[PDB]
Amino acid sequence: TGKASQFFGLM
């Protein structure tokens, strides 16, 4: 789930 790290920055 490393690729889903940038998603956290969107929030």
Coordinates of N, CA and C in Angstrom, one line a residue:
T1 N 0.8 -1.2 0.0 CA 0.0 0.0 0.0 C 0.9 1.3 0.0
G2 N 2.0 1.2 -0.6 CA 2.9 2.3 -0.7 C 2.5 3.3 -1.7
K3 N 1.9 2.8 -2.8 CA 1.4 3.7 -3.9 C 0.3 4.6 -3.4
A4 N -0.4 4.1 -2.4 CA -1.6 4.8 -1.8 C -1.1 5.9 -0.8
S5 N 0.1 6.3 -0.9 CA 0.7 7.3 0.0 C 0.3 8.7 -0.4
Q6 N 0.4 9.0 -1.7 CA 0.1 10.3 -2.3 C -1.4 10.6 -2.1
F7 N -2.2 9.6 -2.0 CA -3.6 9.8 -1.8 C -3.9 10.5 -0.5
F8 N -3.1 10.2 0.5 CA -3.2 10.8 1.9 C -3.0 12.3 1.8
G9 N -2.1 12.7 0.9 CA -1.8 14.1 0.8 C -2.9 14.9 0.1
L10 N -3.8 14.3 -0.6 CA -4.9 14.9 -1.3 C -5.9 15.4 -0.3
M11 N -6.1 14.6 0.8 CA -7.1 14.9 1.8 C -6.6 16.0 2.7

